[PDB]
Amino acid sequence: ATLFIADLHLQTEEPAITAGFLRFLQGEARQADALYILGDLFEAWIGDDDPNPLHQQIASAIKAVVDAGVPCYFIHGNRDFLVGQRFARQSGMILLAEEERLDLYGREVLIMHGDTLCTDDQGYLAFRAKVHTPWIQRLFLALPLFIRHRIAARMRADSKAEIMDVNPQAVVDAMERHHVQWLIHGHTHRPAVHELQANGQPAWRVVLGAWHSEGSMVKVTPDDVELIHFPFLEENLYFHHH
Ligand SMILES: CN(c1ccccc1C(=O)N1CCc2cc(S(=O)(=O)N3CCN(c4cc(C(F)(F)F)cc(Cl)n4)CC3)ccc21)S(C)(=O)=O
Ligand SMILES: [Mn+2]
Ligand SMILES: [Mn+2]
């Protein structure tokens, strides 16, 4: 089976999500043919030179899955678009493009974070265009770490002071551009399986969940497609009247 996750939004103030992700990497992921992380692995990223210990702890844990023989792949989210090749090397992950077409047991599947499908959020798309401009990334990454941390903290506060869903036509256009009947994405935090029509045939759009209270993954096998919700930790059973 091939596994997909997204929207973990890891951060040091949420240690329970980190613990659930480490348990996932130590168990379930080790049996996978491959693991794909479709963006928003981290709540924020200001560059690969950041000494945040959470970054090394996560890199080591992913690298152990890779060393155990499970290739791991990453598509950027809107939160963590600055993840680069230094972190790819540290973690053993392979960085992928904004859109990729995969062969999953004979089934053609498009994968992306999903924010580029949210063409009705013009203000998000304006932000995205700015922070994906190469000279703007190069300028930001040149700034001292402590300045970058101050900028990011301020920008997060400003944003906090509701993620828009995908545009249906943008979904059809992406699935027809790639001539696929299957699409897996995250970003909208609305886990679902949607049936639509693309390329003159039934088509499906599978959406991952955010890791709020529990984890979410999509498991693709040669036989089926599974959207799975599971607890972060091993909830031990323990023991009413008639
Ligand atoms: C869907 N969302 C959004 C909706 C509408 C608009 C935006 C978002 C969104 O995605 N936002 C907004 C807040 C924010 C902070 C981070 S960050 O903290 O990781 N970090 C990244 C690197 N970064 C700079 C800064 C600059 C410069 F200074 F030049 F401006 C350039 C460069 Cl190249 N990177 C500093 C901030 C990442 C993403 C987001 S929402 C609700 O927020 O989830
Ligand atoms: Mn997200
Ligand atoms: Mn997102």
Side-chain angles (χ1 to χ4, degrees), residues 7 9 40 78 113 163 187 189:
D7 300 295
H9 291 265
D40 294 357
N78 61 291
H113 181 60
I163 303 166
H187 185 66
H189 296 187

Side-chain angles (χ1 to χ4, degrees), residues 104-121 123-159 161 163-221:
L104 302 175
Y105 320 99
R107 171 183 351 238
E108 307 139 20
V109 182
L110 171 61
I111 59 163
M112 57 208 287
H113 181 60
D115 56 308
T116 61
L117 305 173
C118 303
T119 62
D120 295 305
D121 193 337
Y124 169 62
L125 287 190
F127 170 98
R128 186 189 196 281
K130 156 188 177 65
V131 296
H132 281 79
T133 304
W135 72 260
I136 299 187
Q137 298 188 351
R138 291 185 326 251
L139 171 88
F140 178 82
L141 290 168
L143 294 166
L145 266 159
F146 73 101
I147 294 292
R148 281 180 269 153
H149 187 81
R150 282 182 13 195
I151 292 172
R154 176 50 182 278
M155 276 188 66
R156 293 193 299 266
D158 283 357
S159 161
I163 303 166
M164 188 153 323
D165 208 349
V166 307
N167 175 277
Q169 180 66 52
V171 170
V172 170
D173 290 351
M175 304 190 74
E176 294 191 336
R177 276 191 293 103
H178 290 268
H179 200 70
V180 295
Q181 311 310 126
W182 282 93
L183 157 65
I184 302 174
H185 70 78
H187 185 66
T188 63
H189 296 187
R190 294 163 174 89
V193 178
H194 303 272
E195 191 173 328
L196 62 137
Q197 285 245 338
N199 313 300
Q201 288 302 45
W204 294 268
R205 179 170 61 88
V206 179
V207 186
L208 284 154
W211 292 42
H212 301 294
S213 298
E214 285 203 346
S216 180
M217 60 184 192
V218 173
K219 189 159 127 163
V220 180
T221 74

